[PDB]
Design a protein around this ligand. Structure first.
Ligand code: SF4
Ligand SMILES: [Cl-]
Ligand SMILES: [Cl-]
Ligand SMILES: [Zn+2]
Length: 217
């Protein structure tokens, strides 16, 4: 149906944004599974700017899970106090390190279900590791991704969130093969710069012509 063109323009718009208004963060320049997974965990409950500021010292000190597991919890907490909830985060990092060391030889598995079951890992982080580290097709769906989908596609997707399989399935089918990274990261950037939480910047949006939400305005 014509829903084919609407989906095609969405993907096209996002892929282009990845090349025209790309944001930058250190973790977007590595493919080490450990760094990507740990960074996604550190980003929770804080901001990219905060993690970016401890990134250099953190990854020089903790080069892998072995480094985390041998370090006292209080020392780890001290090292990441800046991003908050340091003690709770330290405890979680050590548990994750313990499982990866005890069960996977200290290396993150290149398998969806294996990753998803690691301590502290949810559907979004698992998607990030699979896509960013292993280059496998996966949609990194967070609340911001949901927002764009709600607005652009509307209809039966207007009120769904990432706890709805119907919404995650659509996201999955939108991910272009061979360019999962371009799509997920381009969408992350687009959602923040253009289709923002407060007053999307529709006049700068390239797909406003097919956007459901743009019609209600
Ligand atoms: S037209 Fe507006 S609401 Fe629609 S995708 Fe673009 S920014 Fe988001
Ligand atoms: Cl490389
Ligand atoms: Cl290692
Ligand atoms: Zn190691």
């Amino acid at each position: 149906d014509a829903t084919n063109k609407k989906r095609k323009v969405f993907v096209s718009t996002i892929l282009t944004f990845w090349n025209t208004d790309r944001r930058d963060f250190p973790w977007r320049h590595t493919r080490d599974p450990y760094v990507i997974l740990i960074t996604e965990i550190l980003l929770r409950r804080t901001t990219a700017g905060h993690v970016k500021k401890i990134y250099d010292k953190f990854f020089v000190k903790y080069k892998c899970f072995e480094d985390i597991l041998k370090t006292p919890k209080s020392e780890i907490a001290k090292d990441i106090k800046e991003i908050g909830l340091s003690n709770q985060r330290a405890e979680q990092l050590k548990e994750l390190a313990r499982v990866v060391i005890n069960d996977y030889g200290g290396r993150v598995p290149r398998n969806r279900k294996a990753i998803l079951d690691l301590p502290g890992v949810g559907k979004y982080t698992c998607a990030a590791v699979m896509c960013l580290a292993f280059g496998k097709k996966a949609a990194m769906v967070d609340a911001n991704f949901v927002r764009v989908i709600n607005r652009y596609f509307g209809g039966s997707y207007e009120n769904l969130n990432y706890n709805h399989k119907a919404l995650w399935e659509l996201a999955e089918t939108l991910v272009p093969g061979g360019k999962c990274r371009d799509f997920n990261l381009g969408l992350m950037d687009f959602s923040a710069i253009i289709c923002a939480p407060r007053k999307p910047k529709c006049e700068k949006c390239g797909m406003s012509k097919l956007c459901s939400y743009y019609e209600k305005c």
